[PDB]
Amino acid sequence: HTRMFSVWVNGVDQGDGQNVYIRTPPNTDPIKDLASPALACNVKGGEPVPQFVSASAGDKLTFEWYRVKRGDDIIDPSHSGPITTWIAAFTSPTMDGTGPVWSKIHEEGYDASTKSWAVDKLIANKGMWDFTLPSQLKPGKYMLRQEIVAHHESDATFDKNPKRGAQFYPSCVQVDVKGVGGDAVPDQAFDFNKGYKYSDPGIAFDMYTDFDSYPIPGPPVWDA
Ligand SMILES: [Cu+2]
C-alpha cells in the first residue's frame, strides 16, 4: 500500500498533484489481476486530471510517494520489489494507458552487491524516487507511469491463488514536455495486459530462497 503525493522538477516540488496532474486512485489498494484494465494506470486511470507537470526533456523528475500521510513510512517494508518508470504519448484525455503504447525509461530491481531492492531504497530516501526524462524526447504531452511491485506474496501467482500474487502499485502522471531538440518518439509500444504474464520469472518470483538476482519484467530500457 502506497501512492504518489507530488512530482518534483529538478528538486523543486510542484505541490500536491493528487487529482491535479496525478491520476490518483481512490485508495492504496494493490492491482493483482494481470487482465485488469487498472494494471496500467490504476482504478481511475481513464479519468482526465486537469493539469500537466511542466518539465523539459532532460530534467530530473522526482516522484514522491506516501502510505497514509505525506512523509510517513511510505510503504510496508514487507513489500520488497522493483520500481519501473514508463512513458506513453498522451493520445487524448480519456486514455487509460491500456493497449500497446508504453516504453520503459527507468528501472531498479535487486542490487545483489548490497542485497537491497528498489523499495528498500524508496523507503531510505523517504519516498523520493528520481529518474531522468530522456533529453532526446520529442516535445509534447506524455503520460509517465511509475510502478512499485511488491513480491512478499509472489511465491504464488494470482491465477492459481487469488489471495496471494505480485502486487502492482501504478501511478500515472500527466506531463507536458518542453523541447530543447529531441526527435525521439517512444516506440516499444508495450502493453501491460498482454506483456505481463504469470509465467514471468519476474512475476512468479519466490523471495524466500537464496536468489542472487531478479529479472525485471518487460523490455530493457528504451534508447533511441
Ligand atoms: Cu500493501
Curated annotation (Swiss-Prot):
GO terms for biological process: cellulose catabolic process. One of its GO terms (molecular function) is monooxygenase activity. Binds 1 copper ion per subunit. Disulfide bonds join 41-172. (1,4-beta-D-glucosyl)n binds at residues 45, 76, 78, 155. Keywords: Carbohydrate metabolism, Cellulose degradation, Copper, Disulfide bond, Metal-binding, Monooxygenase, Oxidoreductase, Polysaccharide degradation, Secreted, Signal. It comes from the Eukaryota. Lignocellulose is the most abundant polymeric composite on Earth and is a recalcitrant but promising renewable substrate for industrial biotechnology applications. Together with cellobiose dehydrogenases (CDHs) an enzymatic system capable of oxidative cellulose cleavage is formed, which increases the efficiency of cellulases and put LPMOs at focus of biofuel research. Its cofactor is Cu(2+). The keyword Lyase does not apply. GO terms for cellular component: extracellular region. Its EC number is 1.14.99.56. It is an enzyme of class 1 (oxidoreductase). Cu(2+) binds at residues 1, 79, 169. It catalyses: [(1->4)-beta-D-glucosyl]n+m + reduced acceptor + O2 = 4-dehydro-beta-D-glucosyl-[(1->4)-beta-D-glucosyl]n-1 + [(1->4)-beta-D-glucosyl]m + acceptor + H2O. Its main location: secreted. It is found in: Secreted. O2 binds at residue 152. Belongs to the polysaccharide monooxygenase AA9 family. Lytic polysaccharide monooxygenase (LPMO) that depolymerizes crystalline and amorphous polysaccharides via the oxidation of scissile alpha- or beta-(1-4)-glycosidic bonds, yielding C4 oxidation products. Catalysis by LPMOs requires the reduction of the active-site copper from Cu(II) to Cu(I) by a reducing agent and H(2)O(2) or O(2) as a cosubstrate. Cleaves a range of polysaccharides, including cellulose, xyloglucan, mixed-linkage glucan and glucomannan. This is AA9 family lytic polysaccharide monooxygenase A. It comes from Collariella virescens (Soil fungus). The lineage of its organism: Eukaryota, Fungi, Dikarya, Ascomycota, Pezizomycotina. The gene is AA9A. The chain holds residues 23 to 246 of 274 of the full protein.
